[PDB]
Tab-separated table of C-alpha atoms and ligand atoms in Angstrom:
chain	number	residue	atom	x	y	z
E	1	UNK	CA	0.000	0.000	0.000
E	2	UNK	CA	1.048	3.839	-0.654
E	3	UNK	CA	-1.666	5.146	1.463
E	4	UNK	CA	-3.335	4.172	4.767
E	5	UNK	CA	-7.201	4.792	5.037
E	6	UNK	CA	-8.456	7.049	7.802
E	7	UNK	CA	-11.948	7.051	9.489
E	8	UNK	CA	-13.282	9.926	7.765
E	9	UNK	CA	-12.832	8.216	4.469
E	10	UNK	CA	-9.655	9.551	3.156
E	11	UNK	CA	-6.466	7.823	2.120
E	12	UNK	CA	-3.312	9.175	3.641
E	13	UNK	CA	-0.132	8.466	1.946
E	14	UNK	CA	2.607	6.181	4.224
E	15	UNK	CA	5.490	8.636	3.537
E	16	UNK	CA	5.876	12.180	4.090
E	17	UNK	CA	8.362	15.089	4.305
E	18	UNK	CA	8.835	16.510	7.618
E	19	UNK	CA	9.494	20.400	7.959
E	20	UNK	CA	10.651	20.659	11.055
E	21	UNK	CA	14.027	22.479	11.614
E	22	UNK	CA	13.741	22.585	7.544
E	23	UNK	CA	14.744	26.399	7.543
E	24	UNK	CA	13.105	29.437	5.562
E	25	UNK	CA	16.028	29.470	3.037
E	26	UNK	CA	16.035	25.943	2.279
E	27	UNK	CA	12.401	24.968	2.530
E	28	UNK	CA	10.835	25.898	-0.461
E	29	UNK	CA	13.327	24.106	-2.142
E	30	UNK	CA	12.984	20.828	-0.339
E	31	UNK	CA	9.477	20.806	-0.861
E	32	UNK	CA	9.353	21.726	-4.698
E	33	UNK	CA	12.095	18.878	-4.851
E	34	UNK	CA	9.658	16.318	-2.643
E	35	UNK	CA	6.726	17.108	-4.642
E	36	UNK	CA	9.017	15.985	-8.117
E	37	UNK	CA	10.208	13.087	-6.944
E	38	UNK	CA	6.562	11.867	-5.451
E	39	UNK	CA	6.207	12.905	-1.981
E	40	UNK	CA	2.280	13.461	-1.614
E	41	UNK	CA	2.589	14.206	1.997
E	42	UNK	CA	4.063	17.360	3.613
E	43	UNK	CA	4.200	17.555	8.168
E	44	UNK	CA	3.662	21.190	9.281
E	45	UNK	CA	3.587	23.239	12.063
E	46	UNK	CA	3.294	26.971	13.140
E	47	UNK	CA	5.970	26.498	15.913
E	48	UNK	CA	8.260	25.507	12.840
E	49	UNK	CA	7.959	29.231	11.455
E	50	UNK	CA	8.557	28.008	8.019
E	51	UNK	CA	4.962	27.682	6.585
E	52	UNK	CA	5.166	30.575	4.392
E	53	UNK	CA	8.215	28.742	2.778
E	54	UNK	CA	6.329	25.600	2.313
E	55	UNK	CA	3.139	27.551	1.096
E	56	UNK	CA	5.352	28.969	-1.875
E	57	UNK	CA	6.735	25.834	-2.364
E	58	UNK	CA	2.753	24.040	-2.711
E	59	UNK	CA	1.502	26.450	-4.749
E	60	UNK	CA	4.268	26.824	-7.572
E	61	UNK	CA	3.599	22.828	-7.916
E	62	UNK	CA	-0.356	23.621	-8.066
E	63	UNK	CA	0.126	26.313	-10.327
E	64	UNK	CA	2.827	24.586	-12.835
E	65	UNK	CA	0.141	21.710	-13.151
E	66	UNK	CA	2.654	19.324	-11.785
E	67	UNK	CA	0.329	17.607	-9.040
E	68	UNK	CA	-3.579	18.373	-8.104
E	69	UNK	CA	-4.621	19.465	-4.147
E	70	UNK	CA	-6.603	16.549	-4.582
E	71	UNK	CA	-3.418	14.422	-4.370
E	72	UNK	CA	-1.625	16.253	-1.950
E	73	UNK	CA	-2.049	15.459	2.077
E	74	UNK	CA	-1.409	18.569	3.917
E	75	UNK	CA	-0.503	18.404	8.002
E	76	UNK	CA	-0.713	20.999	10.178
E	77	UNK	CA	-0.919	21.522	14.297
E	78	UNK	CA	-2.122	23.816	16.897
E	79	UNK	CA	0.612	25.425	19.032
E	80	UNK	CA	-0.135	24.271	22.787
E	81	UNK	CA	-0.720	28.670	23.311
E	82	UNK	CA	-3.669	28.374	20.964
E	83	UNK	CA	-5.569	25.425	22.873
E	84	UNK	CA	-8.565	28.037	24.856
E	85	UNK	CA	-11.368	27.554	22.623
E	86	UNK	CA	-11.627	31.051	21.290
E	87	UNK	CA	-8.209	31.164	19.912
E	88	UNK	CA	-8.036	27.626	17.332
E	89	UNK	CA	-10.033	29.245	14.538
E	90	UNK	CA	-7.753	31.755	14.162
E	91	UNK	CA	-4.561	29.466	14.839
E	92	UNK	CA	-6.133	27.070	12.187
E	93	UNK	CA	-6.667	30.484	9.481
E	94	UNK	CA	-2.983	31.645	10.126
E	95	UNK	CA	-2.050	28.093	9.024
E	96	UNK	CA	-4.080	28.405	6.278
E	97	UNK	CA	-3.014	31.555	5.115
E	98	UNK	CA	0.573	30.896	5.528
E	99	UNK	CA	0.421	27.567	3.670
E	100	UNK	CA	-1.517	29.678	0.951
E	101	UNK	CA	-4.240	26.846	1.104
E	102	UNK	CA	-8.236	26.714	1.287
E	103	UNK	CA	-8.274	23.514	3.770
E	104	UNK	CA	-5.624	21.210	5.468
E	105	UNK	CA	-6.592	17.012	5.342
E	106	UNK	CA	-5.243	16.649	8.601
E	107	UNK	CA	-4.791	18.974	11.370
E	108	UNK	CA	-3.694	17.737	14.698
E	109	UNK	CA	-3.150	19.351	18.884
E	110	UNK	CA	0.282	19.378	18.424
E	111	UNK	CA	0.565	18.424	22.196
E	112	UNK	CA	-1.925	17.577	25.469
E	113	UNK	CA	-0.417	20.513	27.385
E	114	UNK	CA	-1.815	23.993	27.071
E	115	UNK	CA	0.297	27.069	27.162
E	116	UNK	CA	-0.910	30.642	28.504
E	117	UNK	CA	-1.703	32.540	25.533
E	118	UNK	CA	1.157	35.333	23.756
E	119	UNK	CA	3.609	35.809	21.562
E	120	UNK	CA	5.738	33.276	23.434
E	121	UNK	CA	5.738	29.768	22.011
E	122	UNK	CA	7.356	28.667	25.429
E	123	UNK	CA	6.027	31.301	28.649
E	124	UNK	CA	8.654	30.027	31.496
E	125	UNK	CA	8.698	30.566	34.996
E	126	UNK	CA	11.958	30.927	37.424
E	127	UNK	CA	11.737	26.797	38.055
E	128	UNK	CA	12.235	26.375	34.347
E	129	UNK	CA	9.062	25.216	34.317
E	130	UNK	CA	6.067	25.892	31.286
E	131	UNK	CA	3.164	28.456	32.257
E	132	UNK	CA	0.298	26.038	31.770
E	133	UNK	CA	-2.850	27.122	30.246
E	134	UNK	CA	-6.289	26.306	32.057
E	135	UNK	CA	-7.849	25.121	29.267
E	136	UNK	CA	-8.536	20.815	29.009
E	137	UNK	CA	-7.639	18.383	26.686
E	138	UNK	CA	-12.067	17.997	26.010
E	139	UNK	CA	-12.907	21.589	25.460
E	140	UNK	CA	-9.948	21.802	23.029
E	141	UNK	CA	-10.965	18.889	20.893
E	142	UNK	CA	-14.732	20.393	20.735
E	143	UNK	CA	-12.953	23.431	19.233
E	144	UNK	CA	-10.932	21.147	16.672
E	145	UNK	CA	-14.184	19.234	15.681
E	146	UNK	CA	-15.706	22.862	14.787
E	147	UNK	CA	-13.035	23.390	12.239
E	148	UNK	CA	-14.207	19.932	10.742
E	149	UNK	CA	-17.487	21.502	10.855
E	150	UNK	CA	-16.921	24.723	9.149
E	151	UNK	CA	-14.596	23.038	6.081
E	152	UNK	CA	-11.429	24.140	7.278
E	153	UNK	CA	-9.932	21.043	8.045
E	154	UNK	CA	-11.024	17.443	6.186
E	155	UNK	CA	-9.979	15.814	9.110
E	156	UNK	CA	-8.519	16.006	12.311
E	157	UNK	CA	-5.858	14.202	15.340
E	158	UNK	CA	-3.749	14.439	18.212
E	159	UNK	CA	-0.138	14.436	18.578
E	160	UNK	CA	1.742	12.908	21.540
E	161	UNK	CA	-1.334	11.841	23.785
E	162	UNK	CA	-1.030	8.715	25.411
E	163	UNK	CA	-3.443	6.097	25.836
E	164	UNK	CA	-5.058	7.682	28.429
E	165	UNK	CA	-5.585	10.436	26.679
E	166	UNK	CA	-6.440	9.051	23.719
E	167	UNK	CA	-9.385	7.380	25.816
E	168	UNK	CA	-10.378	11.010	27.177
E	169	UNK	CA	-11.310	12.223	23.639
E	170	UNK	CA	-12.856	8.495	22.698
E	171	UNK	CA	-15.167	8.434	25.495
E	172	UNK	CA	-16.628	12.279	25.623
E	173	UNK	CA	-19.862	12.335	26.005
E	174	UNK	CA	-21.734	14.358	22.531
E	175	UNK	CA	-18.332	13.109	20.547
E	176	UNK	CA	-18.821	14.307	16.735
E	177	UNK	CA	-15.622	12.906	15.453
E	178	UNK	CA	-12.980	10.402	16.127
E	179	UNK	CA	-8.915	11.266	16.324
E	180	UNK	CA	-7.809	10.205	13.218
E	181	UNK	CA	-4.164	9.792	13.588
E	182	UNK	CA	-2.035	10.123	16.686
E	183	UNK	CA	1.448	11.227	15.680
E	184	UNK	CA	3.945	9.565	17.954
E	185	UNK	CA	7.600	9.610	18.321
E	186	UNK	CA	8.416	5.971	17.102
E	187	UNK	CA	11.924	4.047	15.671
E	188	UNK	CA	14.128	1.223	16.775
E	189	UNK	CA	15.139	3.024	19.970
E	190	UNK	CA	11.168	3.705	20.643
E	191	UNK	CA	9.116	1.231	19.410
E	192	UNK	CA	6.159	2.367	21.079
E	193	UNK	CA	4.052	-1.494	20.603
E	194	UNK	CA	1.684	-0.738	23.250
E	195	UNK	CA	0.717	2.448	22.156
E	196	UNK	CA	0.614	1.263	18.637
E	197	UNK	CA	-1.177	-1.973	19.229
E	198	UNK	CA	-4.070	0.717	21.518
E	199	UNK	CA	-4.043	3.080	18.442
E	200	UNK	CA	-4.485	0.832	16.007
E	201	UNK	CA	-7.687	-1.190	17.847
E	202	UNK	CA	-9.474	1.843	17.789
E	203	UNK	CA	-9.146	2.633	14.146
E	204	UNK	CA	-6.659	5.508	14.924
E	205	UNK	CA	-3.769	5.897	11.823
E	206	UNK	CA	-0.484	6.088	13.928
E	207	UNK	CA	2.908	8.496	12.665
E	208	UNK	CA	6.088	8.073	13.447
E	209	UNK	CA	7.613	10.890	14.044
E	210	UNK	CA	11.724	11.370	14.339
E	211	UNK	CA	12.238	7.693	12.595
E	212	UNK	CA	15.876	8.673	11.373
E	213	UNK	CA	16.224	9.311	15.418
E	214	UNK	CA	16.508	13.340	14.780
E	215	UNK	CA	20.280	13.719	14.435
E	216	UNK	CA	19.651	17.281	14.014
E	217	UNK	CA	17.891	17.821	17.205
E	218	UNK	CA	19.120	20.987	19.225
E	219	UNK	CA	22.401	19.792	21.098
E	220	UNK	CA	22.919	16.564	20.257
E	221	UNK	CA	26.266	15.169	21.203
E	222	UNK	CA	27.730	12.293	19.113
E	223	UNK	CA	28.168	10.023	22.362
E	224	UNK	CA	24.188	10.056	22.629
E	225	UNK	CA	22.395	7.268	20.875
E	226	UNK	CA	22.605	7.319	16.333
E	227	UNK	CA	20.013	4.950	15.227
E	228	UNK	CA	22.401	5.982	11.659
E	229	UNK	CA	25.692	4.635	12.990
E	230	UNK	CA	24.260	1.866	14.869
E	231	UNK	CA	26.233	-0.809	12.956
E	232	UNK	CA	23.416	-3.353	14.163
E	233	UNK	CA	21.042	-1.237	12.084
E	234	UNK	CA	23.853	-0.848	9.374
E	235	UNK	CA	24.360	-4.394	8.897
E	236	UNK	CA	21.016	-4.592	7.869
E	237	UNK	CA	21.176	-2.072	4.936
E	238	UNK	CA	24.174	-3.568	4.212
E	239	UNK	CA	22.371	-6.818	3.809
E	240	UNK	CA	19.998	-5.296	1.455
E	241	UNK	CA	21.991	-3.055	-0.585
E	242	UNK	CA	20.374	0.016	1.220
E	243	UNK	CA	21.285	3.141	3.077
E	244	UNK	CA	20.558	3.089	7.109
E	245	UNK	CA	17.817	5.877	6.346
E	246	UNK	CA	16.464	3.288	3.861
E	247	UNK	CA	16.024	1.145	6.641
E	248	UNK	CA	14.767	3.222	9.842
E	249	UNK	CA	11.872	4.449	6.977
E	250	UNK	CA	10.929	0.991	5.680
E	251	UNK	CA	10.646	0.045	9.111
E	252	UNK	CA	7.772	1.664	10.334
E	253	UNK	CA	6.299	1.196	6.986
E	254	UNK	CA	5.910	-2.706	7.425
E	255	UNK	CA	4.481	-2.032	10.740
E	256	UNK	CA	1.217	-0.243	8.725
E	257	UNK	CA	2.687	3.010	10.469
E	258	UNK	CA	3.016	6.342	8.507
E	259	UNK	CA	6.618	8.047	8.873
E	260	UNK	CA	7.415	11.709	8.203
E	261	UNK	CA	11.552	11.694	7.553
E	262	UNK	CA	12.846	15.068	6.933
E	263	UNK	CA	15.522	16.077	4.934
E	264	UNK	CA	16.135	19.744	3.054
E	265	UNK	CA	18.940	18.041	1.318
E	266	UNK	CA	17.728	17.132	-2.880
E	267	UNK	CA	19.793	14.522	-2.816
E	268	UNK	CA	18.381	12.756	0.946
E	269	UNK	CA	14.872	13.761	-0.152
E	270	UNK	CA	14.829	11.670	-3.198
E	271	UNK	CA	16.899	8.361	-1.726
E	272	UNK	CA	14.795	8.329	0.973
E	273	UNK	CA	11.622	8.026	-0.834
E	274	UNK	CA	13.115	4.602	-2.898
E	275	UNK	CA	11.725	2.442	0.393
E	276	UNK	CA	8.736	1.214	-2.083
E	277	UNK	CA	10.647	-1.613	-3.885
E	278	UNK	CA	12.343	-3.633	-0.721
E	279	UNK	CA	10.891	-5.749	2.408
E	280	UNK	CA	12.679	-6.097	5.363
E	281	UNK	CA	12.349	-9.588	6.769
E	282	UNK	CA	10.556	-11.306	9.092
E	283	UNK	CA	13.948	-11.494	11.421
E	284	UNK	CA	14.676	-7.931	10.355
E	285	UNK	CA	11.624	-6.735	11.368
E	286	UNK	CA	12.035	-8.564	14.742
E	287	UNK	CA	15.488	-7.859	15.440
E	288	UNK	CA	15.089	-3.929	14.996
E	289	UNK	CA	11.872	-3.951	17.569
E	290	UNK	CA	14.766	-5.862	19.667
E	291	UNK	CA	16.555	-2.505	19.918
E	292	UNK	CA	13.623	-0.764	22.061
E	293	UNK	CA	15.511	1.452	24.715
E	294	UNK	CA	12.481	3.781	25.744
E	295	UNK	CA	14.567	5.963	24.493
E	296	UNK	CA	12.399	9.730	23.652
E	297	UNK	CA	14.079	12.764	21.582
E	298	UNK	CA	11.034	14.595	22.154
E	299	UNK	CA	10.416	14.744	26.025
E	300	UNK	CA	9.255	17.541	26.742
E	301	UNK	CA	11.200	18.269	29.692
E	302	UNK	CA	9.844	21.666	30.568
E	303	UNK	CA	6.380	20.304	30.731
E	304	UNK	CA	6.692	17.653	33.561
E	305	UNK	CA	4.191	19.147	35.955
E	306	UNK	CA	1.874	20.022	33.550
E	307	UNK	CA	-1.653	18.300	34.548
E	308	UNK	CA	-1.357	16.864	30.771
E	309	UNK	CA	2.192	16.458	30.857
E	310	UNK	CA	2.220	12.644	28.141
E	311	UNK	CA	4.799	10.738	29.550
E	312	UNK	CA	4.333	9.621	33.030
E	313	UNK	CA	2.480	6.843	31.794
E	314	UNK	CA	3.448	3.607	30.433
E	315	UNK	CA	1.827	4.096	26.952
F	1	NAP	N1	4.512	15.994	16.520
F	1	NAP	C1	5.666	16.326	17.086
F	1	NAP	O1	5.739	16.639	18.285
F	1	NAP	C2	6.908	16.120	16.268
F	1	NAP	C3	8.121	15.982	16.909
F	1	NAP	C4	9.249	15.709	16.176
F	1	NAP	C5	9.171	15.588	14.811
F	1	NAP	N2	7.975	15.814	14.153
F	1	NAP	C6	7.879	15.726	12.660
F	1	NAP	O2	8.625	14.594	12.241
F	1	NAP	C7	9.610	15.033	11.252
F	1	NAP	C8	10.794	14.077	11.270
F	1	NAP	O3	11.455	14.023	12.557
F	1	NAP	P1	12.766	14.915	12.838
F	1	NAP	O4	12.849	16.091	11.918
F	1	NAP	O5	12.800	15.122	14.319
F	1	NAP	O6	13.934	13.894	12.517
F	1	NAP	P2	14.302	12.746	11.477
F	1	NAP	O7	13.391	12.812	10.346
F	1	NAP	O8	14.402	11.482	12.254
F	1	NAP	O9	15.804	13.131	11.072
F	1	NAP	C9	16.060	14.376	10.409
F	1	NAP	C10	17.552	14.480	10.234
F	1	NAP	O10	18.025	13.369	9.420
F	1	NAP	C11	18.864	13.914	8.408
F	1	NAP	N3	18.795	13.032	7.261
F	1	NAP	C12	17.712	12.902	6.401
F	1	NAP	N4	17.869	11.944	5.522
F	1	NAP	C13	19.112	11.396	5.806
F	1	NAP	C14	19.831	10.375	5.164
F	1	NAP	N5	19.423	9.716	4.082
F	1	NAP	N6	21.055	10.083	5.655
F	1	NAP	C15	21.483	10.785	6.715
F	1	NAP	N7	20.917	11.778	7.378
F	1	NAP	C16	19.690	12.045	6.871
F	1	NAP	C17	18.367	15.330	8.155
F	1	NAP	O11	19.442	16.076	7.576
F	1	NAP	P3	19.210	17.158	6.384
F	1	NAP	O12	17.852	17.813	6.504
F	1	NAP	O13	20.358	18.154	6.645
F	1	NAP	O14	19.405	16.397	5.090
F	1	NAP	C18	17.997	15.779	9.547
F	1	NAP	O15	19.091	16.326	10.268
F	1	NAP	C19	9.852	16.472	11.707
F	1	NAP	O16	10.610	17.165	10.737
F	1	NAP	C20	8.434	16.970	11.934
F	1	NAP	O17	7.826	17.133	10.666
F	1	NAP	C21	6.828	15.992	14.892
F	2	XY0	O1	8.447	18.950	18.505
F	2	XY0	C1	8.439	19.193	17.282
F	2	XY0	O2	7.387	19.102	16.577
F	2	XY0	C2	9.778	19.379	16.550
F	2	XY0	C3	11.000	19.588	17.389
F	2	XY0	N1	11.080	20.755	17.940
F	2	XY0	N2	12.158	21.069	18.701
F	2	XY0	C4	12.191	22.465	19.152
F	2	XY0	C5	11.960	22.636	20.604
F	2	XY0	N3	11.365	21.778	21.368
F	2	XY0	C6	11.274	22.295	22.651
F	2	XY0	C7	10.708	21.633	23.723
F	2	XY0	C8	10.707	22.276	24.935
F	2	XY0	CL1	9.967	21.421	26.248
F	2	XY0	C9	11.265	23.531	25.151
F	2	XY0	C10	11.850	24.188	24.097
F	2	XY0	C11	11.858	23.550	22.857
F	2	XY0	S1	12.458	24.131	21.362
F	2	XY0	C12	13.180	20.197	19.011
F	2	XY0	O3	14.112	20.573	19.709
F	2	XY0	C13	13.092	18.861	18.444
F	2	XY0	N4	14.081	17.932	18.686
F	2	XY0	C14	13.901	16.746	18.147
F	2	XY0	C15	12.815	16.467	17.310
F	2	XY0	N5	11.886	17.353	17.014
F	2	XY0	C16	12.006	18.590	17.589
């Protein structure tokens, strides 16, 4: 399969570009170059502060005939300062004006934790410590299902809930729609089965998020964990006459997961999307889900008071 199918009726393709820490100057680029090569699924964000890019980037593809918005799977989120009800329109319509587009097929809380509203995307206090917002997880997901309502968004989800809170949304009382996806930080170093296994009972498409284990993430030291240079993982491409990034993306693939790699290099962007014409194997499969070391990139770390703070919890 190239797409998954979601529970309001659309398809949405397994493999995306991700955007984030794609800067302004090199952007537009990477997407125009995704779109070429057959990427039909771009991850957003406002708290990336490159939409604009990627909405030039769209839009010269729409206009040069060179794919349809029909084919095209658009993601965005709501930054956690825009959860009080009153305020997600608006997030949703910057979005949409910044990505230069009439709707989004997916748009998803980006986290459970809400953020006092401001031109902050982090308020801190002297502890270190987020300033929380006193909004809940149920009155922002009535405000998501109104953009469903009103044709702004085809479709909409949740980003690093946990089963929990996943359950929250699934057992409101007056529930109009469903989470369609929850986008999850997920690869051989967080393998996330539980979560996945919950998800995917209930009908709810999962993403893997960071699957290339976000080299690039802020301060990274070359001692910590490289799902890349772990020659385990190498040995494996090797096997198959494939990169390592080959690999960490086919993974997730044969696990009926979507994965959003990112790269703003041409050459990265079109490599990794030749994962359609390989299988891992059966041991493959099985000995990279070995390598779970609950190990999380995206922790956080400010946010572990927070009421809604994700990751107390087993799964
Ligand atoms: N929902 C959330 O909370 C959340 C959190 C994290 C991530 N995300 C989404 O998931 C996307 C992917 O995760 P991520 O950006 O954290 O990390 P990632 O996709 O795991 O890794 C990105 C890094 O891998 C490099 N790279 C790409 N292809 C490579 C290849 N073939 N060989 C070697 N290095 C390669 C990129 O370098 P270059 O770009 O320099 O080529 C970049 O530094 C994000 O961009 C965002 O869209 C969502
Ligand atoms: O969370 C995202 O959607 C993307 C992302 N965003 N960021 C930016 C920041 N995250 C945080 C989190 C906190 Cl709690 C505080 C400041 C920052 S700045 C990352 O550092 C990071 N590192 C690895 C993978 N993805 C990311």
């Amino acid at each position: 399969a190239s797409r998954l199918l979601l529970n309001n009726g659309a398809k949405m393709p397994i493999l995306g570009l991700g955007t984030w820490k794609s800067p302004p100057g090199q952007v537009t680029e990477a997407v125009k170059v995704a779109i070429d090569v057959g990427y039909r699924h771009i991850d957003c964000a406002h708290v990336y502060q490159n939409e604009n890019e990627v909405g030039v980037a769209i839009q010269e593809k729409l206009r040069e005939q060179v794919v349809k918005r029909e084919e095209l799977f658009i993601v965005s989120k709501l930054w956690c300062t825009y959860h009080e009800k009153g305020l997600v329109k608006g997030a949703c319509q910057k979005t949409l004006s910044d990505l230069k587009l009439d709707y989004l097929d997916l748009y998803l809380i980006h986290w459970p934790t809400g953020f006092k509203p401001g031109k902050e995307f982090f308020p801190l206090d002297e502890s270190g410590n987020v300033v929380p917002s006193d909004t809940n997880i149920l009155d922002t997901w009535a405000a998501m299902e109104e953009l469903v309502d009103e044709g702004l968004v085809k479709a909409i989800g949740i980003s690093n809930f946990n089963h929990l809170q996943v359950e929250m949304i699934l057992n409101k009382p007056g529930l109009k729609y469903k989470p369609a996806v929850n986008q999850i930080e997920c690869h051989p170093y967080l393998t996330q089965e539980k979560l996945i296994q919950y998800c995917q009972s209930k009908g709810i498409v999962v993403t893997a998020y960071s699957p290339l284990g976000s080299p690039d993430r802020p301060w990274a030291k070359p001692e910590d964990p490289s799902l890349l240079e772990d020659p385990r993982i190498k040995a494996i491409a090797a096997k198959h006459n494939k990169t390592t990034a080959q690999v960490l993306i086919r993974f997730p693939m044969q696990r009926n997961l979507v994965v959003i790699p990112k790269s703003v290099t041409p050459e990265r962007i079109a490599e990794n999307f030749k994962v359609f014409d390989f299988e891992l194997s059966s041991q493959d499969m099985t000995t990279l889900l070995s390598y779970n070391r609950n190990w999380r990139v995206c922790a956080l770390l400010s946010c572990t008071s927070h009421k809604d703070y994700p990751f107390h919890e087993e799964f």
